[PDB]
Ligand SMILES: Cc1cc(C)cc(-c2nc3ccccc3o2)c1
């Protein structure tokens with residue numbers, strides 16, 4: 101139900117081997133680790149969770165943009181990109197969190213489908 | 215070798231049934247029709263051309279954003295979105311022209327891969 | 329030294345009355361409240377801090393996009409937009425944090441100048 | 444009534460010395476040259492036209508992004524960014540055409556105000 105896709109606006113390519121961490125907000129308002137991985141050669145990270153586990157709640161997707169740029173020998177602005185949203189059962193069932201990265205800028209969009 | 219993908223930033227969905235026209239720049243500097251179609255339920259338009267036909271040159275991808283918004287009952291700013299680029303044989307072989315649409319704004323990125 | 333500007337991609341206008349909260353990473357790694365305000369009729373928020381107070385650190389600029397959208401009758405996707413960055417680590421700079429908002433998408437850019 | 448502002452997403456700065464050509468659709472459906480200029484050190488281009496001259500029409504703002512990038516040693520993807528819109532068809536408005544540039548990506552937003 102959750103996929104993350106990352107693109108590099110400088111090179112016009114997927115952003116490969118980017119670390120991504122997902123957290124779920126706990127009842128005490130802290131962020132608890134939920135799932136993680138590294139984007140593939142296609143810039144995608146699949147397999148993070150299951151329908152059973154991805155219950156309604158507030159989630160945060162943290163994308164390690166700084167390490168990505170540093171590996172390319174480029175100084176970037178942000179520490180990371182963070183995407184924070186509520187998962188809602190009464191909306192479509194599949195969430196794609198997309199991010200488009202530049203050194204001093206990023207875009208993120210949610211594509212929510214059935 | 216050429217795919218076009220269009221997303222709707224207002225609804226968080228693919229932009230479906232969007233008309234797309236591709237032109238190739240002729241020797242006399244006019245734009246000649248090259249290929250066209252409508253985006254699918256996934257917001258994608260595949261099958262526009264072939265490797266044989268997609269020779270080096272300057273191409274323009276025109277996305278009929280205004281009709282898309284009007285069909286949703288929303289007044290938009292732009293007449294269309296236009297993406298103009300040179301196809302280069304010494305780069306990767308597959309070009310994805312992506313567009314992210316809002317009523318008063320759009321983003322476009324090229325993802326060029328092997 | 330720190331300004332925030334927010335635009336609305338739906339209406340083609342400044343995003344007015346957007347709440348913004350700034351935090352700074354403390355020595356204990358918690359996010360300490362640093363400054364807050366709301367965007368004006370121009371979509372800008374000025375006067376958050378001073379060059380004396382805006383020391384080196386890791387800052388988080390939280391833009392309350394959900395609270396903004398709900399008021400135009402849009403149930404938007406994100407809770408807020410968070411912009412996290414190291415500031416002033418090569419000496420004082422001026423930072424503009426710009427954000428462009430749509431209900432299911434946003435972008436943010438930093439413009440950094442050396443006075 | 445017509446301003447263009449351009450930012451560079453790579454450097455986190457205004458995009459300076461960017462050429463901009465504006466055209467207007469003529470009665471014969473050709474693109475007639477309307478105004479041109481270059482962005483300043485602030486990334487802004489002011490003074491393109493006057494409210495008298497900026498009549499209703501379909502306008503195209505061509506931003507010469509390739510010419511810009513080639514100079515920072517980036518071979519970029521696009522030839523230019525084209526922004527095409529109907530203006531002033533409900534009476535005079537003020538238009539800001541903003542663009543955010545990366546070598547393989549750009550975004551553009553319009554801010555439209557009624558004086
Ligand atoms: C935030 C943003 C900006 C742009 C120009 C494109 C996209 C985008 N999001 C995508 C999700 C799936 C496949 C292709 C996609 O392209 C996302």
Ligand SMILES: Cc1cc(C)cc(-c2nc3ccccc3o2)c1
Nearest residue numbers: 333426428435436437541550551
């Ligand atoms: C992150 C972003 C993306 C785009 C296409 C535009 C802006 C933007 N933010 C602006 C604030 C004041 C004047 C012009 C502005 O343009 C900010």
